[PDB]
DNA sequence: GCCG
DNA sequence: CAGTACG
DNA sequence: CGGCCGATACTG
């Protein structure tokens, strides 16, 4: 990054929009934020900022005043909720729309919401481990989750193909979490497994916490949820893991290396082509009303690999290492 | 907020 | 359904 | 004007 100095004032109020609830203007900031630091060379006039895609006339204002006051005048009447909107809705499970109703109930702190606020299942785990969601992994500790699941599920079934994604995949030294995705070369063996698989690692006490696991349906997709490894100074670390059938594999492991701003960069370009993109499949023709909502299925290409759906897309390919954005 |  | 979440 | 990713996947 060229232009820390910006993207560090920036994302105050990109923040404070997305806390507040005004996501559009927040992603305004954060595809403002993505292109800076992603310039090949700091900024240094208004005209040079109108030039790069993402940047426009007010915000490049607002990049001149900062080149040219060191500050942003701007950051000085952020409402005083901030603060509070950010600590409440950084607790898994609640949002912008939680968080404003706690604080317009009077809640301040995180002591409130213990013993005041009505938490959902959800929101109770992510109270309990409020700190330790916002810590980030040594990509090692990635490497010793994943294959406690991968050797937990081949030790049901030896074909299960097991990959470790997101910021994993991309080669970042940490983690947020670690995305394990899981599929079966014969298209079928996939089936029905996240309920053998859970148990196991239940068994051995590996997963402390369930978030979303729906158990009761034998289409289950994905399972968020909290594990910790065994042995001391050991944290909860978040594990997210999808099953998905092999057909779908090109496009789920594409969806699960993300990044997320890579992938809706990548999704709004299928759109343009007429086309529709997923973590389950790549259409071509697709039915859209309107306002650009799919309502009628198109074609589903054959994706056996990325690299397909990049061809597909008319784009070079781009390791996982690139697709940080 | 940005862009067409 | 609205809310929140995944990349 | 109006889309900004996904006819995305759970929860209650
Ligand atoms: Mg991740
Ligand atoms: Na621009
Ligand atoms: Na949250
Ligand atoms: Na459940």
Same mark, same amino acid.
């Given at each position: 990054?060229?232009?820390?100095?910006?993207?560090?004032?920036?994302?105050?109020?990109?923040?404070?929009?997305?806390?507040?609830?005004?996501?559009?203007?927040?992603?305004?900031?954060?595809?403002?934020?993505?292109?800076?630091?992603?310039?090949?060379?700091?900024? /240094?006039?208004?005209?040079?900022?109108?030039? +790069?895609?993402?940047?426009?006339? $007010?915000?490049?204002?607002? *990049?001149?005043?900062? %080149?040219?006051?060191?500050?942003?005048?701007?950051?000085?009447?952020?409402?005083?909720?901030?603060?509070?909107?950010?600590?409440?809705?950084?607790?898994?499970?609640?949002?912008?729309?939680?968080?404003?109703?706690?604080?317009?109930?009077?809640?301040?702190?995180?002591?409130?919401?213990?013993?005041?606020?009505?938490?959902?299942?959800?929101?109770?785990?992510?109270?309990?481990?409020?700190?330790?969601?916002?810590?980030?992994?040594?990509?090692?500790?990635?490497?010793?989750?994943?294959?406690?699941?991968?050797?937990?599920?081949?030790?049901?079934?030896?074909?299960?193909?097991?990959?470790?994604?997101?910021?994993?995949?991309?080669?970042?030294? /940490?983690?947020?979490?670690?995305?394990?995705? +899981?599929?079966?070369?014969?298209? $079928?063996?996939?089936?029905? *497994?996240?309920?053998? %698989?859970?148990?196991?690692?239940?068994?051995?006490?590996?997963?402390?916490?369930?978030?979303?696991?729906?158990?009761?349906?034998?289409?289950?997709?994905?399972?968020?949820?909290?594990?910790?490894?065994?042995?001391?100074?050991?944290?909860?670390?978040?594990?997210?893991?999808?099953?998905?059938?092999?057909?779908?594999?090109?496009?789920?492991?594409?969806?699960?290396?993300?990044?997320?701003?890579?992938?809706?960069?990548?999704?709004?370009?299928?759109?343009?082509?007429?086309?529709?993109?997923?973590?389950?499949?790549?259409?071509?023709?697709?039915?859209?009303?309107?306002?650009?909502?799919?309502?009628?299925?198109?074609?589903?290409?054959?994706?056996?690999?990325?690299?397909?759906?990049?061809?597909?897309?008319?784009?070079?390919? $781009?390791?996982?290492?690139?697709?940080?954005?």
């Amino acid at each position: 990054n060229h232009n820390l100095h910006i993207t560090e004032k920036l994302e105050v109020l990109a923040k404070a929009y997305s806390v507040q609830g005004d996501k559009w203007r927040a992603l305004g900031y954060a595809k403002a934020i993505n292109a800076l630091k992603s310039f090949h060379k700091p900024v /240094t006039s208004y005209q040079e900022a109108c030039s +790069i895609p993402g940047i426009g006339k $007010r915000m490049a204002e607002k *990049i001149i005043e900062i %080149l040219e006051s060191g500050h942003l005048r701007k950051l000085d009447h952020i409402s005083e909720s901030v603060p509070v909107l950010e600590l409440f809705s950084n607790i898994w499970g609640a949002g912008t729309k939680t968080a404003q109703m706690w604080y317009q109930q009077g809640f301040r702190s995180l002591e409130d919401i213990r013993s005041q606020a009505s938490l959902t299942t959800q929101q109770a785990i992510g109270l309990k481990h409020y700190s330790d969601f916002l810590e980030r992994m040594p990509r090692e500790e990635a490497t010793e989750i994943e294959q406690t699941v991968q050797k937990a599920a081949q030790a049901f079934n030896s074909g299960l193909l097991c990959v470790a994604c997101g910021s994993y995949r991309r080669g970042k030294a /940490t983690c947020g979490d670690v995305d394990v995705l +899981i599929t079966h070369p014969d298209g $079928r063996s996939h089936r029905g *497994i996240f309920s053998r %698989l859970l148990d196991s690692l239940r068994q051995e006490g590996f997963l402390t916490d369930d978030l979303v696991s729906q158990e009761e349906n034998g289409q289950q997709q994905k399972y968020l949820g909290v594990c910790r490894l065994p042995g001391p100074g050991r944290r909860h670390r978040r594990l997210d893991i999808i099953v998905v059938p092999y057909s779908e594999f090109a496009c789920a492991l594409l969806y699960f290396t993300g990044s997320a701003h890579f992938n809706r960069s990548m999704r709004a370009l299928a759109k343009t082509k007429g086309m529709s993109l997923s973590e389950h499949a790549l259409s071509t023709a697709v039915v859209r009303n309107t306002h650009g909502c799919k309502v009628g299925p198109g074609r589903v290409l054959p994706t056996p690999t990325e690299k397909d759906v990049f061809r597909l897309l008319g784009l070079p390919y $781009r390791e996982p290492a690139e697709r940080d954005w």
